[PDB]
Amino acid sequence: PLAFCGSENHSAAYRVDQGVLNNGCFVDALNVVPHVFLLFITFPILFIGWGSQSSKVHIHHSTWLHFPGHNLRWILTFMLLFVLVCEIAEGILSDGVTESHHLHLYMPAGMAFMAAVTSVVYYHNIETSNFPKLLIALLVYWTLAFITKTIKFVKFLDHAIGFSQLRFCLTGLLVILYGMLLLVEVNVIRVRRYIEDLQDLGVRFLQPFVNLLSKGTYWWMNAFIKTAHKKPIDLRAIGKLPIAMRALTNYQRLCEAFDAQGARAIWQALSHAFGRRLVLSSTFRILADLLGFAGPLCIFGIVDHLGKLGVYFVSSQEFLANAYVLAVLLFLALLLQRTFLQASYYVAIETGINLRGAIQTKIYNKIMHLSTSNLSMGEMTAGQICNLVAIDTNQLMWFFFLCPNLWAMPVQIIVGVILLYYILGVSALIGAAVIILLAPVQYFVATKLSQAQRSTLEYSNERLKQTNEMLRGIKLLKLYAWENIFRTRVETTRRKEMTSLRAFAIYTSISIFMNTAIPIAAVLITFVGHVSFFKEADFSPSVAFASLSLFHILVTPLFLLSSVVRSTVKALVSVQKLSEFLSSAEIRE
Amino acid sequence: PWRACAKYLSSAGILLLSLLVFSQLLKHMVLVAIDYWLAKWTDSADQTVYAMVFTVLCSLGIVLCLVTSVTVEWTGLKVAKRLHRSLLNRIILAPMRFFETTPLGSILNRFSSDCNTIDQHIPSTLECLSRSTLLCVSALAVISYVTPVFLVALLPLAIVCYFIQKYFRVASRDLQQLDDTTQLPLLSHFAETVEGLTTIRAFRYEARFQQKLLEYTDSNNIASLFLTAANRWLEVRMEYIGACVVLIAAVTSISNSLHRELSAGLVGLGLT
Amino acid sequence: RARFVSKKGNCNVAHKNIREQGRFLQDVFTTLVDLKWPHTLLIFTMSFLCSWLLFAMAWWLIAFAHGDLAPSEGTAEPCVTSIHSFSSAFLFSIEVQVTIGFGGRMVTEECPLAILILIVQNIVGLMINAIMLGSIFMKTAQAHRRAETLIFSKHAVIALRHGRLCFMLRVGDLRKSMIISATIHMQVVRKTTSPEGEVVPLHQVDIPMENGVGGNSIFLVAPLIIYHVIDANSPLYDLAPSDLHHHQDLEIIVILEGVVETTGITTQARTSYLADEILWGQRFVPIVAEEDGRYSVDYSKFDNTVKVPTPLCTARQLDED
Amino acid sequence: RARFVSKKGNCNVAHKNIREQGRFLQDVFTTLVDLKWPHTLLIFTMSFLCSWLLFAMAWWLIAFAHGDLAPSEGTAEPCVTSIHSFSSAFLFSIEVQVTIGFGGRMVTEECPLAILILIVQNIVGLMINAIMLGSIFMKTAQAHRRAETLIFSKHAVIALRHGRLCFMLRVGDLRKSMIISATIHMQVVRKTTSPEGEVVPLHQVDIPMENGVGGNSIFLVAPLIIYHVIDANSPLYDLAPSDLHHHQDLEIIVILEGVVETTGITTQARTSYLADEILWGQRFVPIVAEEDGRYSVDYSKFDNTVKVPTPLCTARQLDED
């Protein structure tokens, strides 16, 4: 059948014998009326307003202003959805303990789920207005809903329902998040007082100025995708840059880093220029794959279970033990992990693009105060100057693309082996072959790779300056018949660069062989050391497949560790060549 | 596809391309064989027969990744040498009418940056490409082995991933090309401010060419930022599709091992 | 190159980058009746279903609060008789609010809060009965659908009448109903600049129709010839016949507007005319024939032309001989 | 110093010391629909509650008069079945008057005075159903809320066009709906005296808009420039640029009025312009751009000005060289 409590005793559970709030059926019956208040007032305001007034007409595509409490209310609304889908999964299978379909456990949370998504689209559309008088009833929603949850919550204390009940910990968290949603709405009352950048036509990038869910998922990048099949995109339809991330603004930040004050001077001034956006990128890179370690705990939790008031209210440890709730926890954790990894990748490439703008302006201001005795007599060639912008900034930019992975590999591998110690014990310390093997042999191939890269970069600069005097001097070489002699001179210096590449290729090959060869030896040494020599402990399938996904998630940045030790040595010699160019001989005024 | 990668394979050679595809096919087959023997060995209810064949199949794994590693360094070395010294021999016998009509910076640009990405950037990218796509299709093979109604979950999902691939692709055939539309001025502008430095300091137009380089760097950084934001939009879309693949495979392996028999390790194969 | 308003009569504007959307919320009624027909039908049944669901939860909550949903009862009367589900209260809110009122579900005299929610039920249900039925009658009662039954010419012409160049077209009505106080506004619209250098981009200047008095008021039963004398005060005074070509910024809008006789609600039809839509030198066919006691208009010969030799020069060059 | 009508468009008058309030009682309907929204809602539910309470006392009095409230009874039928309280008769008057009609309370055929009060119940209840639902539809259906979606300029300007000083402003519509027969009335209003000594305190004199014909009728889709040529017959003829300052008795009212297309009910928006609101010498920005097949109006550049050098003298001093 159906109703909004069950027909279990069939004459009980709708009864009012005391005052009416003593029924738990009555307090989750009262827990739907703020949500249907918010749905049933906010549906005709959203239908005649933002959307379906035929909003093909444009109501300021650019200059999206953000309120006080924006970047807080979206994280709190996603925390409401993280507690509320868990409240849905708690109401189900406490429904499924007995029969005949209790709807009072999870239909209030589903009405709160629809109220949560309509309140966040109402807050985004009031943030398009700057008309916060048309906010105001949403604030009334929070001083409905919170109060009703506290009239739930003291009736958890009145029937002495403890902390080991899961819905106690759910609804106390819901009481305090409704409380801080009230605190941020009186913070909008504090500073806006109901009782923008001058974003012009030239800004068309919007990702500093869009909302946080479109900062994560790039909903602004559906436009310039759907219109790309209409029109081929050109240089005026992408617009101009904003004022932050201007090349002169990053140039002014680099001169402010310079006068605050060698190779250590340009490195420490570079970290003083860009380190706060760098630690934002690596902080997102810390929280990404710390979310991903809840992957293998879910793997152990589902195949551990698959290897195997009157109780039905409480669930907590069996709520963590069941399989479908861990699968939707895997879905929400993997959604949130790929969102933080793509956000970290965006702000790392954005900091590197601003650095390419800043040192291209600083390398041109070195060029405008350069004496021409360095070009003419001896030292600098014009091929080396256009390689110093065209190659030797791009190697540094690729190092700043790969920098927060270098800052987030130790917090991945240490929390991975401590979670290996939780899932396997000291038999997982037979697989400490990564920490007794990896970093001295990667430093040994970092020394051999860097000596090969220094010899390869000087041979490449000699081959490019020899091809630059070759190709400008074609007509004298074809008019005096020395082209085979000059081709053999390029061929011998090409053979020197080819032998430097041959040493580079055998050292790169032995590092990528050790890089993919040690984790399959780690699953060898953990699976044979669990069974043999530490004999008759256990061998479940559960910690076996949990440690297999743990060793695969250890090996997944290990294949990028060979890419990052392919990097940084061009950055070190590029900063060395840039400090040698930036301390060249200049013009006295 | 394009013809020129087969040109790459005729500068590789038939023994290199066949040794490459043989080494990748047996290395990915021996890692899915060590996963299937982890399925056979974790379902206990004869011991060390499984551990003996586990150790020698892992010995096939480390020698197959060794011959993977040396075949990708030797195909990088042979296309490094072979795509030099033939372009060098075609440019040493050329007419003067070819040099007087073509721009010289184009020919030195293919001698410099294109030869740099052939001898440097391409063989690890080849390794990561072929390793990742054979890991993806062997993962699709072991997931489609266990839960065959995931074959029904083959039918929209990769296809609509193919559809959003087409909904990317011509925009990238705009926009990456638009990056080269603001790449080719700016370094040439650096060429114009190295052959003419005494003239520009004689004319005192240094702030004007400074402002022109600020405009060129503004256009180049907004084209790299829009190519960046298209790339991370495309990756957050398709990794949301991949987490949806994880969800539908997870709920059909839990629903097909609760009520059917999958022996509690094949679900670990599909989930890993 | 493009049209200001199409040959149907819909405009071609965009209205980009508006800011004050708070005054869009300061009229809800024109924004309610301004919508399309699935939007009007969806806001109709969503308004009534939101009313019936909200009071269904109110009647189910007050039946839970009296304990009448608990069947362990004695001889005490309920608030509402025979409610034992949510769907019984949904049936009861449908019976009360649109006043069907069956009576197996009826409300007794036990608690007064049921009487207070019954009072506020028929107040807001009677109120949104008035708002929604007057809104759907105002949606069907607009008169621009009458503007779909008013034909203009497909081609306007320029010919000679009374020694002068005149701009002529033909307006016809399909109905035997009338148009009360039929007003004609003919605007030329092009990018004109000032002599002082103010360039205004889409300039509308009113030309007058020729009437006999000069008041813009006609009497439309037959298809007539609206004609404008191109004199020196007209802004068509230096129009050449070589200017009548595609990609030429010169547009005519004719606007026929007035009350339609059988609703009392005013309408406005509009038609543009482009430079490749204006035919030089031609004139319209006589289309009204009198036979067997009846005047009669052929409508198949509406936009046909019976082309006459004209001077191929401007009206400023009509001032000599 | 103070405004005649504010920049919203509400007037600033008082109407003190009226005597004939008997003619205020000679229209009850415009005074009914003239009220504010809590006054209209309070007279709505107080009209229906006064009807239900008055007939509740009538049905309870006739149930007392038949003795049916006395439960010491035999097999004689009541007038109305199952009434045994005042609240049962209040339920019965609610069931009859808005015609819910449940039927546990039903009226039998015993006495005819119940039939006479049932006849007069549905006559005055059906009558005030018609008056109150047509009144609340006439309350929501007024068109001055459409006057909240019509923007004028924040600053009117005075510039040069065709050799003459002209008073210009910009009117825009936010909607894709239309205004049927858009009439412009521009009145200057100031304290003028007569030459004979009659000082009249707030004088309104009509200036004409420049149209091309002279009829005050525009066609509003784009924001246009309403401009008035300051000639010798205008009363702005001796206006200096030094007069444009605060505390100067010179006010402009522009009045845009006409039928809105989707209701058929006429509206009127109005905007004043003060002497420190009129900018001398400036002109308006071109705001309409044509791109990808669409004309498009920027609304952020609405009241911006692109100031031009002008003669700093009156239009009477424009008559020399």
Swiss-Prot record, chain A:
Q: Where is the ABC transmembrane type-1 domain?
A: 278-570
- Its transmembrane ranges are 30-46, 72-88, 106-122, 136-152, 169-185, 283-298, 325-340, 407-422, 429-441, 510-525, 545-560
Q: Which residues are glycosylated?
A: 9
Phenotypic consequence of residue 110 to R: In HHF1; altered intracellular trafficking
Outcome of residue 131 to V? In PNDM3; likely pathogenic
Residue pairs linked by disulfide bridges in the UniProt entry: 5-25
Result when mutating residue 131 to L: In PNDM3; pathogenic; reduces the sensitivity of the K(ATP) channel to inhibition by MgATP; increases whole-cell K(ATP) current
Segments in the Extracellular topological domain: 1-29, 89-105, 153-168, 299-324, 423-428, 526-544
Q: Changing residue 71 to S: what effect?
A: In PNDM3; uncertain significance
Upon changing residue 199 to K, the result is: In PNDM3; likely pathogenic
- Which residues lie toward the Cytoplasmic compartment? 47-71, 123-135, 186-282, 341-406, 442-509
**Mutagenesis or variant effect for residue 350 to K:** In PNDM3; uncertain significance
Location in or out of the cell: Cell membrane
Name the linked condition: Leucine-induced hypoglycemia: Rare cause of hypoglycemia and is described as a condition in which symptomatic hypoglycemia is provoked by high protein feedings. Hypoglycemia is also elicited by administration of oral or intravenous infusions of a single amino acid, leucine.
- Entry function: Regulator subunit of pancreatic ATP-sensitive potassium channel (KATP), playing a major role in the regulation of insulin release. In pancreatic cells, it forms KATP channels with KCNJ11; KCNJ11 forms the channel pore while ABCC8 is required for activation and regulation.
The UniProt subunit note reads as follows: Forms an heterooctamer with KCNJ11; four ABCC8/SUR1 molecules interact with one KCNJ11 homotetramer.
Name the family the entry cites: Belongs to the ABC transporter superfamily. ABCC family. Conjugate transporter (TC 3.A.1.208) subfamily.
Could you identify this protein by its name? Answer: ATP-binding cassette sub-family C member 8
Source lineage: Eukaryota, Metazoa, Chordata, Craniata, Vertebrata
Tell me the gene name.
ABCC8
Of the intact sequence, the residues represented are 2 to 621 of 1581
